[PDB]
């Protein structure tokens, strides 16, 4: 008695998560340079 989310909704979730991941990776990379890893 609750709905499967549509794949259109799934498609959007993936796009949103990939953009978040791209930013976080850039942030990790720059922080490590500040620490001199």
């Amino acid at each position: 008695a609750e709905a499967e989310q549509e794949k259109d909704q799934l498609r959007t979730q993936v796009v949103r998560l990939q953009a978040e991941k791209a930013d976080l990776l850039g942030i990790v990379s720059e922080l490590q340079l500040k620490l001199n890893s």
Binding site: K21, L25, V28, S29, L33, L35, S37
Partner: protein
């Protein structure tokens, strides 16, 4: 924490040798031929089991181009295993493995597990680096060697499971004292 062990892995080597494709094959069991050069770094998780224990692999897929050398080299510290990838159809990428090894030795821990992957071994006709030469380079450095293909799915699973086993065995032997 689902997992019992946690291993940080890196893939390094010249741009275009197939590091991202090798990881994509391991991650998602697929292959795409359109080249999209990695911008700095990419990241994938996969949890495998060895000896009935759950081994979480945090895998860092580094850009090969020298413009990203500073960014990518800061990921070396703390890595527990590193794939050194060249392209069997590209002799320069093979020649450069020795420089990649120097980059490991200058930035990673002394006992990091290392492995050399001669990738794109499905492209037999355009081979430039014989398997014997790859094996000899690896033997010169005491490092394990395999020829792989992300496209034909040759030795990708084998390469990661073997590197993980070697890391796990080193840790277990250390624990028992």
């Amino acid at each position: 924490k689902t997992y019992d062990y946690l291993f940080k892995l890196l893939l390094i080597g010249d741009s275009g040798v197939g590091k991202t494709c090798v990881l994509f094959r391991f991650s998602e069991d697929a292959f795409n031929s359109t080249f999209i050069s990695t911008i700095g770094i990419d990241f994938k998780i996969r949890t495998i089991e060895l000896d009935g224990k759950r081994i979480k692999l945090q895998i860092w897929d580094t850009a090969g181009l020298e413009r990203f050398r500073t960014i990518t080299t800061a990921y070396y510290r703390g890595a527990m295993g590193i794939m050194l990838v060249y392209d069997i159809t590209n002799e320069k990428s093979f020649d450069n493995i020795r420089n990649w090894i120097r980059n490991i030795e200058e930035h990673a821990s002394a006992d990091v597990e290392k492995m050399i992957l001669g990738n794109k071994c499905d492209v037999n006709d355009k081979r430039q680096v014989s398997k014997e030469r790859g094996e000899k380079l690896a033997l010169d450095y005491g490092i394990k060697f395999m020829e792989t293909s992300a496209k034909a799915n040759i030795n990708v699973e084998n390469a990661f499971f073997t590197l993980a086993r070697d890391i796990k065995a080193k840790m277990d032997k250390k624990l028992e004292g």
